């Protein structure tokens, strides 16, 4: 729409064709951009899992502070989330509410971990290498760029043996051994 | 209560009719000021009813003077009479908006039945007509207002200044710039004529060193083979036989080393020699004109030192006004590169420069300078010369 004149803007204050309150600030689109999420509904599936954690933490908080049941369950939740890599620290229980976000889960997707391990220059580049069958976790090739990698499984992300990328790494340092390939 | 508007253009007089009257109480409000800028709003206020162009440039200047003096010209009287309706002198009067208040009393005298208005309301309409200009004339032939302003502007300005061609001294600067150019070209072309005919008769260039005489002779003796006693007399008439060149050329043309050039080549030499002849005559004609102009423009300066030397001095300063404004010392160094004014020798030069400075002042600031003061001023220098 053209720029509204003064008298028009006064009579059309709430008119906005591109930003609505139900959009929630386009947080989904922003986060999908940062971590290169290709399925439009992956964010809102993560959001429902975050909501489940936040619902449980709120219910636990309403239990009396010295309750052994409360302390046990909050620790188990902190243990499980830290192991998955969603939570960076286990010290504080308020992290279950403040620091449990969709961005935290997206930050454990295979492309992002490849980027942080410097296996790819960008998350977009990592997605392409996954889709092109260069990446293996353990002995298993993975072409799904939504694979969530736990802390323990981050040790087994590596290139496929006959990958052209692997040969380039070894050729660059003059360490290519054609017996292996 | 404004009903008609008078606007004065460089091209002619325009009369408009006010269709709507703008608000007076709210005159200073912004929206009534903006409508003057907007043509869509303005055109609803006024409309053109008449336009009477001036006959020519002369009439434009006369009406520019009359409008400047707040007088009603015959042309202005005609357009107003044709347009303004007749009304009572007392009961009710047609209203006319005029830019100048001094013009009001004049129009009232000619037309008792029109009341003139020049208040701020009238000025706003006049400002709008000026602002939009030819756009309001609905294509009527108003020429081009910007161009006619330039012509009328110079005319009006000089008429008050009473500028005259007599005060013009740039003719002197042109003449001197041309005169020395002719002195260069006459020599350069004359030298070429010596070379070209030198091939056909090289020794003759030695016989007649003076180039102008050489050109006239070559025009006669086109081919050195042609040698007759009557021809000897005819070339003997050219210049004089005192130098004996008349006998030398006839004897020498008989025995010479010049290789004969084609007829077409000779045609160029005579025509090119003819060319050198024309510039020599034109140069003398221009030289007399410079002498005549110097007396008219700067009789004192010309009489005191001379026409050519004065002309060079004016050109160096760049103008007669520039020469006058200079101090006496600056005038002395103005002619110190060509020695125009030239220990005791320097004292005359310094003395002469001061007198030349005063002579310039008399010439520049007098509408019709005389040579009376130049004569006595030169006489004063002569006494100083004898003393030293």
């Amino acid at each position: 729409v053209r720029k509204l004149k003064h008298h028009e803007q006064k009579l059309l204050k709430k008119v906005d064709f591109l930003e609505w309150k139900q959009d929630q600030g386009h947080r989904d689109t922003q986060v999908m951009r940062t971590y290169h999420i290709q399925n439009r509904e992956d964010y809102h599936k993560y959001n429902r899992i975050c909501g489940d954690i936040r619902r449980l933490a709120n219910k636990l908080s309403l239990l009396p502070p010295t309750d052994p049941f409360r302390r046990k369950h909050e620790q188990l939740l902190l243990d499980k989330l830290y192991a998955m890599g969603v939570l960076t620290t286990k010290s504080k229980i308020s992290d279950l509410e403040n620091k449990v976000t969709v961005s935290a889960i997206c930050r454990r997707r295979l492309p992002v971990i490849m980027h942080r391990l410097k296996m790819a220059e960008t998350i977009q580049d990592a997605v392409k290498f996954i889709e092109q069958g260069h990446v293996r976790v353990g002995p298993n090739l993975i072409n799904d760029p939504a694979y969530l990698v736990t802390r323990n499984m981050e040790d087994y992300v590596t290139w496929v043996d006959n990958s052209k990328i692997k040969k380039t790494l070894l050729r660059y340092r003059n360490q290519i051994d054609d017996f292996d390939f | 209560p404004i009903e008609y508007l008078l606007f004065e253009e460089p091209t002619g007089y325009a009369v408009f009719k006010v269709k709507l009257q703008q608000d007076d109480i709210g005159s200073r409000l912004k929206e009534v000021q903006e409508q003057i800028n907007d043509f869509g709003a303005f055109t609803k206020l006024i409309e053109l009813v008449s336009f009477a162009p001036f006959k020519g440039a002369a009439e434009a200047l006369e009406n520019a003077n009359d409008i400047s003096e707040g007088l009603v010209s015959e042309s202005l009287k005609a357009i107003l009479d044709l347009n303004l309706p007749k009304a009572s002198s007392k009961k009710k009067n047609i209203t006319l908006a005029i830019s100048d208040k001094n013009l009001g009393p004049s129009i009232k005298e000619e037309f008792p039945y029109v009341d003139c208005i020049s208040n701020e309301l009238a000025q706003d309409l006049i400002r709008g007509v000026r602002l939009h200009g030819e756009k309001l004339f609905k294509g009527l032939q108003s020429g081009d207002l910007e161009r006619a302003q330039l012509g009328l502007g110079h005319a009006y300005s000089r008429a008050k200044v009473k500028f005259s061609v007599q005060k013009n001294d740039n003719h002197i600067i042109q003449a001197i710039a041309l005169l020395d150019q002719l002195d260069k070209d006459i020599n350069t072309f004359a030298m070429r004529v010596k070379e070209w005919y030198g091939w056909h008769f090289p020794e003759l260039a030695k016989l007649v060193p003076d180039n102008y005489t050489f050109a006239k002779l070559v025009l006669f003796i086109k081919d050195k083979a042609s040698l007759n006693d009557d021809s000897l007399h005819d070339l003997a008439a050219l210049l004089n036989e005192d130098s004996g060149i008349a006998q030398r050329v006839i004897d020498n043309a008989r025995i010479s080393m010049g290789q004969d050039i084609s007829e077409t080549d000779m045609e160029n030499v005579c025509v090119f020699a003819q060319r050198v002849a024309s510039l020599a005559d034109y140069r003398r004609q221009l030289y007399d004109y410079l002498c005549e102009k110097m007396h008219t423009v700067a009789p004192n300066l010309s009489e005191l030192i001379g026409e050519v030397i004065g002309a060079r001095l004016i050109s160096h300063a760049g103008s007669l006004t520039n020469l006058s404004k200079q101090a006496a010392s600056t005038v002395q160094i103005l002619g110190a590169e060509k020695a125009l004014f030239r220990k005791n020798k320097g004292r005359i030069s310094r003395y002469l420069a001061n007198k030349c400075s005063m002579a310039s002042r008399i010439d520049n600031y007098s509408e019709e300078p005389s040579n009376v003061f130049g004569s006595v001023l030169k006489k004063q220098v002569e006494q100083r010369l004898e003393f030293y």
Binding site: - | S50, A52, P53, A57, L61, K138, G139, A159
Partner: protein, 380 residues
Amino acid sequence: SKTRYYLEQCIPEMDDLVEKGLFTKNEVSLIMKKRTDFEHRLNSRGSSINDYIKYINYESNVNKLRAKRCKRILQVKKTNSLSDWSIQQRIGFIYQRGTNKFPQDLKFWAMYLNYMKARGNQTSYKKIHNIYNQLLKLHPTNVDIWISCAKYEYEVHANFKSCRNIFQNGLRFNPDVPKLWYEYVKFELNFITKLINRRKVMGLINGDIALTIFDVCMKTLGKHYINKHKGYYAISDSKMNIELNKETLNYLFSESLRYIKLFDEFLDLERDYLINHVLQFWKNDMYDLSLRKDLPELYLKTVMIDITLNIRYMPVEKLDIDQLQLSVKKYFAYISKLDSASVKSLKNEYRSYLQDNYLKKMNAEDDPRYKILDLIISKL
């Protein structure tokens, strides 16, 4: 929009056409479709006067078609209803809009005046006057307009008084145009000749004013010609001033000569009296130049007219020897005051004038005056 208002103004007419049966609704639809195009053309940017001309021509053809179906179908010269004058009213309105939008185009103004003059019964003369009042104000300096309304009111209506005031007012704006002077004097001589011919008519059943205009014409025209060719400034050079003075004398001489030719037409007036005033005018020194000394060629023509003045209009049948004797007597008198070169030219012209006008039209054998003229011609 303006277009819709103008289209709706057509509806009462188009409804009347259907009612009278002259046009069918489909045909009425086609006419409005073409009008819709034109009204949009006129109300839009980029409209030119050609759009007005086309729309006027189209409406004219519609009127002709309506008139012909009126006789073919209704079998009546007129149907007393709006459709009779609706088109004619509309065409006048297009002309008003065109002239207001484009006052510069003089061709369109001429078309408007011709159209309104042609339907005199429909358009009162007062409406013609309003157009001329508006046109004259927009173009005061176009002499053709001033003559046109001057002519229109003197032939259609014969208001010498109002036709006079037009020339009085026109010359007030354009004193430097010799054509307007020439036409104004032509009207006055026509007014006098019509008056005398009216006087002649009464008897059976029972020019100075022009010269005053000529005299002021000579004065006024010279003044403006000096103002032109001088530009903003006077001419300092004495010689160039004298040249400019000659140009006016030659310019004014040519204009005065045209008036001499103009007098020839009016048989009723004592033209010889009218001509002699012009000759008397040129005897007086003007602008410090004497015709005899500075411009002999013009002076010879002035003498030529004077010598033949009494015999100029005498037919060969009524040729009087005494008048010829007066004519030749004038010729010798000027010779004694003329140089040899001037005398030779005057002698040749005078011989030719007598030979062509009289001798070649005289029978040599039957007229005794032939021998006298031949003897005079030989002696001249």
